[PDB]
């Protein structure tokens, strides 16, 4: 009786074949408001996926369980994000953090280009200023803080604020290896303002610092009056300057050392 | 329940008319319906493609997809669509509601018949390639296979999506030219990655290139590597401008003082074995 037609045979698409179980490398690098399509997802799976990817909203895009994850936030922490340039995310399980994905783990994602934003500045200021100093990390941090000069208003204020904070700190004791790196990078900046800041910082140093560290810049008069005799700068011969640590020379002295043969 | 007949359409071959008589004659009808829009290698509307087919509740999703050439299909996602009704016995038929044919009628028929099902019309929308697997990521980012890749993972590393994969890839093949195009974007995980590599293998030519990029702007990432490498390799000749072995002094020829040694005076042009503060002054002399 009825003129029956069976539907034309179904031919799926990639979307339809997608499986979120396989997609951690696809989903982690996604950005805010970018809809990451994940295939049909059954209702009894929604909680697992919401657990795993808590920074994302779970959305139903279409029929038959078709779905997507939409990133909402970066909830990775300064302790785990700021003390490294290595990693943009980590997977968390049982109080432990692992670089590699493990099932049962929850993904946390670091804020992008975070160091250029200055949101790590309060963490590293503490961390690097102690026995918690990691030379490589802590140097890198100051280097790149300077590079925020040509970037963003946020990063330029960052730069400014940190610079103010570091002036006041390093005036107290420029020996602390964090302040050594600061001065090192001012020298690298190599403008009038970076030079006179060094001299400013250096000129506020303590009684012991100057005799322990700046003998080249503060010679004894016996030493000083020999220098007058020669048209070679004092630095080109003075044994106190061949030894000395260049990060604690004043600009004049630092300049002068380059002029010898 | 009698004289079922399929009347041809006037215009759309896909469109048809289903005529029918009934035991109750007040239910008599001439229903317009369409089916099987041809397989599409193109779009119905701006960014849209809507097959002339009603997806009854419970019908397999792929049935919408059967009317799109599979290559052209990879880009498109299937979202929800407006309520439609279909003939159970001929499921996937799109009923058009025109004149005598009216939602009341259809609501009513269902009440009295199992010859009516309902669903949503197939609505496809254009986005980009989906990429649901790790290998799919590796192929796109490394550029060993590029063909079915979205822009986010195939823009010569402009955006950052590939940094996770390239972090591990390039650790293994630092010399890879793509690892170098990646590093040339100067985002912090690349630079950081190469500071680790070159701290171990500074003597490679890729470390030369590493240094060549990061300077002038991100020089610290090279200085860090030089320091550790030369700390870990005191026997290497090329290290002695940066860590000169007099026990009291390895800082001896840093900064201004670099011009003092004849060796460190340009002999070879090899920036990498002198720190930034150092090789600035070399030229200054």
Residue numbers in the entry:
A (entry chain B): 8 to 268
B (entry chain A): 7 to 291
Paper text:
The final structure, with a resolution of 2.7-Å, was refined to Rwork = 0.243 and Rfree = 0.273, respectively. Within the crystallographic asymmetric unit of the structure, a single A16 protein and one G9 protein are present in a 1:1 binding mode. Traceable electron densities can be observed for A16 residues L7-C291 and G9 amino acids E8-N268. Both A16 and G9 feature with an extended rod-like fold. Sterically, the NTD and CTD of A16 are linked via a relatively long loop, which might be of certain flexibility. Unlike that of A16, however, the inter-domain linker in G9 is of short length and an inter-domain disulfide-bond (C89/C127) is observed to form, dragging the two domains into close proximity. Resultantly, the two protein subunits are aligned almost in parallel, leading to good complementarity and the formation of an extended binding interface. In order to characterize the atomic binding details between the two proteins, we further subdivided the binding interface into five patches (Patch1-Patch5) based on the G9 components involved in A16-engagement. Within these three patches, a large number of interface residues are identified for inter-molecule contacts, including G9-residues F92-N93 and T95-H96, and A16-residues D170, T173, R177, K194-P195, S198, D202 and F227 in Patch3, G9-residues D120-H122, R142-N143, H146-Q147, G150-S151, N154, H191-H192, A195 and N197, and A16-residues E166, R193-K194, S198, S201, D223-F227, D229-T230, Y233-V234, Y282-N283 and R290 in Patch4 and G9-residues C243, C248-A251, V253, Y261, L264-G265 and C267-N268, and A16-residues D257-K258, L260-R263, C265-W266, Q287 and C291 in Patch5. It is noteworthy that the amino acids involved in vaccinia virus A16/G9 binding are highly conserved among members of the Orthopoxvirus genus, demonstrating that the orthopoxviruses, including the monkeypox virus, would share quite similar binding patterns and likely the same interaction details for A16/G9 sub-complex formation.
Poxviruses are a group of enveloped viruses, the entry of which require the fusion between viral envelop and cell membrane. In poxviruses, however, its fusion process is mediated by a large proteinaceous machinery, which is designated as the entry-fusion complex (EFC). It is believed that poxvirus EFC is composed of at least eleven virus-encoded protein subunits, among which the A16 and G9 subunits (nomenclatures of A16, G9 and other proteins refer to vaccinia virus, a prototype membrane of Orthopoxvirus genus in Poxviridae family) form a sub-complex and play a key role in EFC assembly and function. In this study, we reported the crystal structure of the A16/G9 sub-complex from the vaccinia virus.
